[PDB]
Amino acid sequence: NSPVSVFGLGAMGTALATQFLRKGHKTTVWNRTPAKAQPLIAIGASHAPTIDSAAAASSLLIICQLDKASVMQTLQQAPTAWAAKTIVDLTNGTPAHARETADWALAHGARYIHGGIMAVPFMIGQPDAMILYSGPAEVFEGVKDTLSVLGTNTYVGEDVGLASLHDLALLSGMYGLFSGFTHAVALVQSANIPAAGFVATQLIPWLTAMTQHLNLLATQVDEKDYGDGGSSLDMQAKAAPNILEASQAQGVSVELIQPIFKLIERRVEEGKGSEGLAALVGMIM
Amino acid sequence: ANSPVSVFGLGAMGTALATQFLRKGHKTTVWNRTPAKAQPLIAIGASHAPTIDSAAAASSLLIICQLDKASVMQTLQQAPTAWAAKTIVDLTNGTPAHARETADWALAHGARYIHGGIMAVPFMIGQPDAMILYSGPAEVFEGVKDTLSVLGTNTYVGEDVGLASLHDLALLSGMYGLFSGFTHAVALVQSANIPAAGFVATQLIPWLTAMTQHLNLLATQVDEKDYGGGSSLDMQAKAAPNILEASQAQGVSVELIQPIFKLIERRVEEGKGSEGLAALVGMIM
Numbered sequence: 001n002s003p004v005s006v007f008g009l010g011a012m013g014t015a016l017a018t019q020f021l022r023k024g025h026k027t028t029v030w031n032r033t034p035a036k037a038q039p040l041i042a043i044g045a046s047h048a049p050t051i052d053s054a055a056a057a058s059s060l061l062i063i064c065q066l067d068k069a070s071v072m073q074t075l076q077q078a079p080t081a082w083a084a085k086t087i088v089d090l091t092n093g094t095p096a097h098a099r100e101t102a103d104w105a106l107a108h109g110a111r112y113i114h115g116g117i118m119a120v121p122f123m124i125g126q127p128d129a130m131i132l133y134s135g136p137a138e139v140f141e142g143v144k145d146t147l148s149v150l151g152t153n154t155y156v157g158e159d160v161g162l163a164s165l166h167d168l169a170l171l172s173g174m175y176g177l178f179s180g181f182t183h184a185v186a187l188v189q190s191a192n193i194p195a196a197g198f199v200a201t202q203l204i205p206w207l208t209a210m211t212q213h214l215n216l217l218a219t220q221v222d223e224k225d226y227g228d229g230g231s232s233l234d235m236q237a238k239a240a241p242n243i244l245e246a247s248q249a250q251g252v253s254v255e256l257i258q259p260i261f262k263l264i265e266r267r268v269e270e271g272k273g274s275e276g277l278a279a280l281v282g283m284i285m
Numbered sequence: 286a287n288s289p290v291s292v293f294g295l296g297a298m299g300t301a302l303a304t305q306f307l308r309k310g311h312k313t314t315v316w317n318r319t320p321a322k323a324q325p326l327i328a329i330g331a332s333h334a335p336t337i338d339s340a341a342a343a344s345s346l347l348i349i350c351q352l353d354k355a356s357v358m359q360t361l362q363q364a365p366t367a368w369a370a371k372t373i374v375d376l377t378n379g380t381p382a383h384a385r386e387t388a389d390w391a392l393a394h395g396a397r398y399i400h401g402g403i404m405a406v407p408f409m410i411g412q413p414d415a416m417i418l419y420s421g422p423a424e425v426f427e428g429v430k431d432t433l434s435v436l437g438t439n440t441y442v443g444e445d446v447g448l449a450s451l452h453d454l455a456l457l458s459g460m461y462g463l464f465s466g467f468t469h470a471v472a473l474v475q476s477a478n479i480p481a482a483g484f485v486a487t488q489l490i491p492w493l494t495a496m497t498q499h500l501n502l503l504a505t506q507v508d509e510k511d512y513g514g515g516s517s518l519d520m521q522a523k524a525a526p527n528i529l530e531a532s533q534a535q536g537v538s539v540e541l542i543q544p545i546f547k548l549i550e551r552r553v554e555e556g557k558g559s560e561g562l563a564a565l566v567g568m569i570m
């Protein structure tokens with residue numbers, strides 16, 4: 001099957017190479033440090049001794065390194081190696097990082113798309129694994145069938161920085177969820193209530209219900225029509241002080257939840273207490 | 286001809302409660318400070334009480350769903366002889382202390398008293414995924430739980446009359462985390478003119494659903510006071526600058542998510558970067 005090369009053999013790059021081998025692709029691997037190659041040599045990979053050698057083995061080149069700086073250090077070490085190849089860069093970073101990297105690649109005669117892996121290394125290979133892609137549509141089309149070995153492809157558009165924007169937005173969502181878990185569990189723990197049962201039987205079911213409610217809020221964001229949905233900001237601005245006061249009586253810091261309470265209060269002070277929660281998005285933009 | 290009930294407060298939530306009692310065949314008497322809000326309920330079979338006194342005299346099970354504890358006290362103190370030998374079920378949002386203060390007054394005026402927390406928005410009332418928490422004397426709860434089971438799934442959480450409110454405010458803080466995450470993520474995609482609806486339905490919800498299951502493992506680690514490799518705080522502390530920098534380039538404020546990033550960084554500086562997210566709970570206690 002179609003050869004592939006993988007540059008960077010940390011946790012995610014190891015899993016990517018492993019899955020290409022499992023599906024029968026001739027897989028060439030490279031890493032700054034040689035030791036991380038050995039688990040992949042053990043299951044049939046070729047270890048390339050140089051960046052040049054890895055680039056010559058395949059026309060599809062996958063880069064999965066620490067950061068954009070490291071990607072640039074790899075590219076600049078063999079600047080004639082990239083011509084007429086397709087580079088698929090799965091290295092985490094900002095939208096700007098992806099645009100800057102694409103500029104260099106184009107100037108050196110390569111084709112370039114950026115991807116964001118929304119998945120833990122163990123999930124690689126499963127349909128559960130969402131991988132976002134951005135950059136020129138024709139470049140993606142030319143390699144998507146091979147890339148579909150790693151997970152479910154989701155192309156998100158032409159601007160090569162979009163996959164990173166989507167990735168970082170999803171991670172922001174997760175950091176909010178974790179903020180809520182932390183505050184809720186601290187409050188019950190302050191009254192010597194075990195965390196396990198509370199989370200399994202009360203917090204997860206409640207978060208599941210409100211996670212579905214997010215589709216209503218998203219519709220209201222698009223329509224710029226911030227109806228209350230039966231839960232007005234005026235009413236919420238009376239429950240939030242109670243959450244703060246009980247937290248303080250229990251000795252629990254309010255640092256993780258006070259920001260959104262100040263937003264809710266600001267909207268009431270603008271005269272729009274009869275709206276609902278979809279109004280907050282525009283306030284931080 | 287089912288067991289009579291009285292409902293005090295006909296805002297969005299109180300309207301839904303009264304509606305459900307009528308739908309299930311109960312003689313339902315209703316009262317509101319602003320009397321016009323009774324008319325949609327008279328239209329579906331309710332009796333409108335002209336006074337607090339008359340609403341209290343119509344039933345033995347008396348439900349109050351107004352705004353805050355101050356409002357409940359204003360209602361109680363207007364007819365101090367009306368409450369004797371009744372069961373008051375107070376579903377009005379407040380702190381644990383508010384529930385204890387209210388119960389003291391009720392007991393002194395010859396009433397029985399339970400406090401509850403409605404974990405549902407109005408349209409959810411009557412469906413299986415509506416959870417209502419209850420606390421106070423177990424025999425008082427026993428006397429009315431079958432009637433109350435019309436609103437949702439009863440969850441008794443103990444005898445201290447303040448416990449339902451502690452549980453309620455903890456679950457609400459969980460939800461405000463989730464909503465902080467939605468708000469930041471949708472602002473990021475909206476800053477690049479991406480519709481909220483498709484992103485939320487096909488990318489954000491499935492991601493949040495996966496990460497929600499991970500919360501069981503974190504809760505176990507909280508109980509065992511044993512945190513963690515896994516996803517070490519050290520790695521998380523590498524995603525955060527990418528999210529902050531991309532937010533700044535897009536003109537999106539970081540006020541909703543910066544707190545958790547600062548907590549994480551404090552734990553790394555204590556020498557415990559190899560621990561996991563469950564360590565955060567103890568830090569805010």
Ligand SMILES: NC(=O)[C@H]1C=CCN([C@@H]2O[C@H](COP(=O)(O)OP(=O)(O)OC[C@H]3O[C@@H](n4cnc5c(N)ncnc54)[C@H](OP(=O)(O)O)[C@@H]3O)[C@@H](O)[C@H]2O)C1
Nearest residue numbers: 230231294295296297298299318319351352356377378406
């Ligand atoms: N909606 C949701 O998503 C629910 C989520 C879980 C439960 N949650 C709680 O349940 C109650 C009622 O909420 P609702 O949305 O109905 O509030 P409003 O629509 O603003 O109605 C407030 C009511 O409180 C009364 N209220 C307000 N102040 C008073 C006083 N002082 N005395 C008596 N009654 C009072 C007011 O009477 P009014 O219509 O303004 O005349 C209304 O009947 C409140 O404590 C909420 O925190 C709500």
